[PDB]
Amino acid sequence: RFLKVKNWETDVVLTDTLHLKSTLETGCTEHICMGSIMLPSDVRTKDQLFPLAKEFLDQYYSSIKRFGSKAHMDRLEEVNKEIESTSTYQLKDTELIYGAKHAWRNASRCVGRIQWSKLQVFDARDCTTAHGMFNYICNHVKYATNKGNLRSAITIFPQRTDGKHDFRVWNSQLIRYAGYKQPDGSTLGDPANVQFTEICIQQGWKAPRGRFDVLPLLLQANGNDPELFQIPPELVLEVPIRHPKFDWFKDLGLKWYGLPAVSNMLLEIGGLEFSACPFSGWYMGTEIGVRDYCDNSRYNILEEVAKKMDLDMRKTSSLWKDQALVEINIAVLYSFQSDKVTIVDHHSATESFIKHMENEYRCRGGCPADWVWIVPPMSGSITPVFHQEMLNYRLTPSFEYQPDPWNTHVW
Amino acid sequence: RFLKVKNWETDVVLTDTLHLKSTLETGCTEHICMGSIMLPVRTKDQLFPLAKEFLDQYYSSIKRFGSKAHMDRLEEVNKEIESTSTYQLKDTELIYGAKHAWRNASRCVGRIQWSKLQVFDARDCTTAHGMFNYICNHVKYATNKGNLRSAITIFPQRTDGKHDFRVWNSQLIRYAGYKQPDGSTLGDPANVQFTEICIQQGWKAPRGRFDVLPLLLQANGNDPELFQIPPELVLEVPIRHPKFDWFKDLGLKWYGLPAVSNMLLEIGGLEFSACPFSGWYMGTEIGVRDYCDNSRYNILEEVAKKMDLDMRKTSSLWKDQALVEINIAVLYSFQSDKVTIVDHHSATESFIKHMENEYRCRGGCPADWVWIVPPMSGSITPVFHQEMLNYRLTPSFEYQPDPWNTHVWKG
Ligand code: HEM
Numbered sequence: 170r171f172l173k174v175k176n177w178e179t180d181v182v183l184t185d186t187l188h189l190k191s192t193l194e195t196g197c198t199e200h201i202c203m204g205s206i207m208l209p210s211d212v213r214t215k216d217q218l219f220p221l222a223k224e225f226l227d228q229y230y231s232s233i234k235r236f237g238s239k240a241h242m243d244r245l246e247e248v249n250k251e252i253e254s255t256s257t258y259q260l261k262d263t264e265l266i267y268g269a270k271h272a273w274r275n276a277s278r279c280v281g282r283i284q285w286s287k288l289q290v291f292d293a294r295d296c297t298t299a300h301g302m303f304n305y306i307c308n309h310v311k312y313a314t315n316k317g318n319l320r321s322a323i324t325i326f327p328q329r330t331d332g333k334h335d336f337r338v339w340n341s342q343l344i345r346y347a348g349y350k351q352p353d354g355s356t357l358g359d360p361a362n363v364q365f366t367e368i369c370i371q372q373g374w375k376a377p378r379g380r381f382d383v384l385p386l387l388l389q390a391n392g393n394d395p396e397l398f399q400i401p402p403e404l405v406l407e408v409p410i411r412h413p414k415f416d417w418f419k420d421l422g423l424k425w426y427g428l429p430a431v432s433n434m435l436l437e438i439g440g441l442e443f444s445a446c447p448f449s450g451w452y453m454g455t456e457i458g459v460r461d462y463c464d465n466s467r468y469n470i471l472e473e474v475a476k477k478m479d480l481d482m483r484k485t486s487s488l489w490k491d492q493a494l495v496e497i498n499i500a501v502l503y504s505f506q507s508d509k510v511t512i513v514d515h516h517s518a519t520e521s522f523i524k525h526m527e528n529e530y531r532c533r534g535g536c537p538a539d540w541v542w543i544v545p546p547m548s549g550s551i552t553p554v555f556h557q558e559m560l561n562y563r564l565t566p567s568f569e570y571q572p573d574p575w576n577t578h579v580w
Numbered sequence: 581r582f583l584k585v586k587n588w589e590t591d592v593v594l595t596d597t598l599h600l601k602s603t604l605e606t607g608c609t610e611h612i613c614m615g616s617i618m619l620p621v622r623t624k625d626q627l628f629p630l631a632k633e634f635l636d637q638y639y640s641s642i643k644r645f646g647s648k649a650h651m652d653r654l655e656e657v658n659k660e661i662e663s664t665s666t667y668q669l670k671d672t673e674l675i676y677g678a679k680h681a682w683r684n685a686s687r688c689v690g691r692i693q694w695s696k697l698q699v700f701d702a703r704d705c706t707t708a709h710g711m712f713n714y715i716c717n718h719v720k721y722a723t724n725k726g727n728l729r730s731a732i733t734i735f736p737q738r739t740d741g742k743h744d745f746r747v748w749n750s751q752l753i754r755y756a757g758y759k760q761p762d763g764s765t766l767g768d769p770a771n772v773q774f775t776e777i778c779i780q781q782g783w784k785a786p787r788g789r790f791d792v793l794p795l796l797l798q799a800n801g802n803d804p805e806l807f808q809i810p811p812e813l814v815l816e817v818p819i820r821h822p823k824f825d826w827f828k829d830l831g832l833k834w835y836g837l838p839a840v841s842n843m844l845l846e847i848g849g850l851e852f853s854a855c856p857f858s859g860w861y862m863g864t865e866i867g868v869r870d871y872c873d874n875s876r877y878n879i880l881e882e883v884a885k886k887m888d889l890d891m892r893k894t895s896s897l898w899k900d901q902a903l904v905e906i907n908i909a910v911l912y913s914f915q916s917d918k919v920t921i922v923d924h925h926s927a928t929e930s931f932i933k934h935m936e937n938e939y940r941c942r943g944g945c946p947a948d949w950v951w952i953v954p955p956m957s958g959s960i961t962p963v964f965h966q967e968m969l970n971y972r973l974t975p976s977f978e979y980q981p982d983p984w985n986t987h988v989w990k991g
């Protein structure tokens with residue numbers, strides 16, 4: 170159980186000892202593997218919290234080469250006393266930054282983790298109101314976008330106290346296109362957002378009912394009813410999607426936004442729960458062109474793209490879906506690159522991830538990785554991660570999923 | 581204890597009770613998932629329970645559980661084990677066992693076909709020449725002039741592990757690979773090691789790029805012997821492309837019959853170490869893995885040049901674009917020659933239908949997402965959005981070590 174992982178393309182073998190530090194559970198047993206289940210999964214108690222805090226502080230002070238020091242023992246004492254009195258505790262700024270960077274480092278489903286130590290952490294724990302949240306979020310978006318030279322960032326709102334005072338961003342991402350169901354057939358805009366696009370209207374939004382309407386933010390501070398806010402358009406960088414060879418591609422009227430900013434996850438550090446912690450990076454091209462555009466339960470544009478290419482759509486064995494899919498993803502990359510907005514193709518990002526794995530085995534002893542999520546959704550086996558065995562285990566600090574607010578909120 | 585899987589494109593949810601019948605182990609624990617690890621001498625002591633559970637299964641499937649035929653067979657196997665240390669399967673039992681080994685093969689996307697397996701009983705075989713003869717008839721029957729038929733040939737079971745039958749080839753038909761002194765490889769790099777063994781055993785190698793390897797056959801634990809499959813029995817398909825006339829000039833071909841010969845068939849505790857089985861190809865097995873893996877024929881670049889793509893930066897997706905064309909050419913060539921083949925769109929759709937049907941009538945269908953999802957265009961196939969439970973059922977096909985690592989040479 171000092172496990173080894175082999176790359177069957179290069180025969181590189183790595184030995185994983187970091188998994189022995191694993192704490193949480195995977196959902197698998199020796200009788201059944203759940204590696205392909207999307208989600209295999211009230212506040213803590215004075216006795217639940219301190220071991221968690223100690224585990225986190227132990228690794229923090231190790232990482233700064235002060236394990237077993239005065240400063241270490243003092244901080245443990247101090248936190249231990251604050252828990253005993255206040256039934257929670259507060260992270261020093263340095264601990265906050267470390268916890269956030271390591272929650273990314275530990276995200277076994279993220280292919281972009283070679284960047285993990287360059288995260289910009291915005292401490293929003295002094296925030297008290299949704300208007301305040303909105304202000305922090307606009308500043309996030311502007312900093313991260315950086316006129317198309319995107320930078321990684323996280324903004325961290327106050328930690329959970331009793332579950333009645335939760336801070337939540339109700340959007341799944343800070344920037345997403347609206348989705349409206351039609352009186353007649355399918356859906357206009359983005360089908361994944363149809364419910365939220367209705368909870369916005371059903372809460373006051375007036376929708377332009379277009380194909381690419383940026384949704385408003387729905388912000389919840391200290392557990393009150395959430396509030397609608399419109400992100401200033403000049404803060405929302407968008408890329409019109411054209412093809413470098415097909416002039417008709419422009420006529421399809423497609424665009425996407427430059428900033429992927431996930432806002433519905435929960436960040437856990439030393440047992441403390443940050444239920445509102447939007448984080449953002451930059452897109453891998455397939456995220457838009459393969460999933461957002463071509464998933465059948467999304468924009469599902471493969472039909473008409475192939476028609477405009479005049480491919481034989483009669484039999485699946487012409488691979489017309491595959492041919493169109495390539496062209497769409499060529500265009501996405503072409504457009505972002507042409508407008509100088511940061512993006513990475515799936516070849517470069519998976520090659521980066523192999524180098525990152527290599528680094529983590531060398532300087533950390535392992536790297537938890539979820540093959541089902543790391544392998545891109547197109548051209549899987551011509552990327553190097555396909556031939557890479559991976560070990561998946563849960564380390565902390567971590568990002569976790571949490572229920573959608575509207576099913577929980579005492580409205 | 582019931583378990584649920586969800587299709588995230590259709591919201592179809594299915595309930596698995598079959599995993600409870602699972603006995604073997606996955607390699608996973610609650611604290612580590614080994615879902616992407618490629619690979620994770622038996623006494624009378626443990627054999628009657630294995631026999632009994634298999635016979636219980638068999639007689640349940642024929643609606644005779646607890647019958648006198650069922651009780652008598654159990655008694656007969658029992659006494660045969662204690663007095664002879666092993667036991668022999670009835671013909672009906674072997675046919676059932678082989679079919680259910682295929683049905684249980686969680687990494688196989690082709691299992692909708694599992695009940696139409698032609699079972700050839702070669703348990704009376706005693707010499708390598710007899711093995712060659714049985715394999716020839718398998719190849720002729722399965723190939724059927726291009727109208728392929730699934731088939732398996734079952735050689736005598738292991739006894740003391742010192743008298744094993746083995747097919748030393750990994751597949752019955754496969755191209756040789758030669759390492760040249762300049763470091764380049766002629767032919768199929770996957771088969772360099774086996775090619776060398778054949779040459780050492782006295783095979784006179786043509787030293788071409790598509791030479792069919794000889795059969796290397798081991799009976800009753802004796803040293804293996806070389807045999808040449810009659811070329812009129814080896815159906816091959818020249819690869820051309822429906823629009824690119826230069827594609828034929830790449831000189832590529834492939835054989836029509838995928839027949840895997842290095843696995844071990846386990847039935848009621850009996851181990852069948854030689855059990856070649858065959859079906860027909862999914863297009864991507866040849867077009868994506870065989871031709872385009874960097875450690876295989878690796879033809880992407882030469883196809884990319886002849887297509888005149890931007891090969892300077894990988895964000896042009898020249899690799900993805902060439903990959904689609906190669907796979908179009910594979911499918912076109914096989915259909916043109918009326919050789920059975922299936923594209924990855926048709927095969928994954930069939931699997932989903934199979935899987936749903938198996939949940940209904942069997943209570944489950946063990947499935948290995950990592951292997952089921954095709955190596956190109958993953959998310960535009962329906963299995964990508966399908967949650968899957970992986971567990972181990974018997975009868976089963978298992979990996980076994982390469983015989984040249986374990987064989988005691990007679991000389
Ligand atoms: C900087 C460039 C980044 C790239 C290219 C990238 C790429 C990806 C991709 C392709 C996925 C697969 C999920 C999907 O397909 O929807 C993913 C998941 C994820 N990313 Fe990254 N990411 C980046 C930055 C970040 C940052 C800055 C964070 C947090 C600080 C982060 C945290 C995560 C998490 C937590 C998940 C998976 C959540 C889950 O479902 O368990 N990523 N990422």
Ligand code: HEM
Nearest residue numbers: 682685687688689690693730731857858859860861862977
């Ligand atoms: C008839 C059409 C069939 C098709 C299209 C098919 C397709 C496939 C594919 C694509 C794989 C993944 C292997 C890889 O890509 O490297 C696979 C695995 C497998 N197939 Fe099927 N198959 C068929 C028939 C059969 C038959 C007749 C058997 C045995 C009786 C069988 C047994 C297996 C097994 C045991 C595996 C897993 C190998 C492993 O665990 O490494 N298949 N199949």
Ligand SMILES: Cc1cc(N)nc2cc(-c3ccc(OCc4cscn4)c(CN)c3)ccc12
Nearest residue numbers: 207208281429430431448449450451452453456
């Ligand atoms: C920072 C960053 C950059 C980047 N380029 N891509 C990212 C993708 C994700 C991410 C994480 C989980 C997800 O969930 C799938 C799902 C569907 S239903 C229950 N779960 C999704 C997609 N909704 C995206 C998170 C962060 C990213």
Ligand SMILES: Cc1cc(N)nc2cc(-c3ccc(OCc4cscn4)c(CN)c3)ccc12
Nearest residue numbers: 177618690838839840857858859860861862865
């Ligand atoms: C009956 C049938 C039909 C069909 N169309 N495809 C099939 C593919 C496989 C199969 C089984 C294991 C394999 O090995 C993986 C590996 C590489 S290194 C250690 N393990 C491979 C790869 N060559 C193919 C087996 C049977 C098939």
Ligand SMILES: C[C@H](O)[C@H](O)[C@H]1CNc2nc(N)[nH]c(=O)c2N1
Nearest residue numbers: 555556557558616617618950951
């Ligand atoms: C490391 C990884 O498990 C390995 O490359 C697997 C991944 N999935 C696969 N899937 C199929 N169908 N065939 C394969 O050979 C593999 N190889």
Ligand SMILES: C[C@H](O)[C@H](O)[C@H]1CNc2nc(N)[nH]c(=O)c2N1
Nearest residue numbers: 205206207541542964965966967
């Ligand atoms: C059913 C399956 O687990 C689900 O579709 C997963 C598979 N792999 C994925 N991989 C990535 N990167 N993103 C995803 O949303 C998914 N979805």
Ligand SMILES: [Zn+2]
Nearest residue numbers: 197202608613
């Ligand atoms: Zn698992």
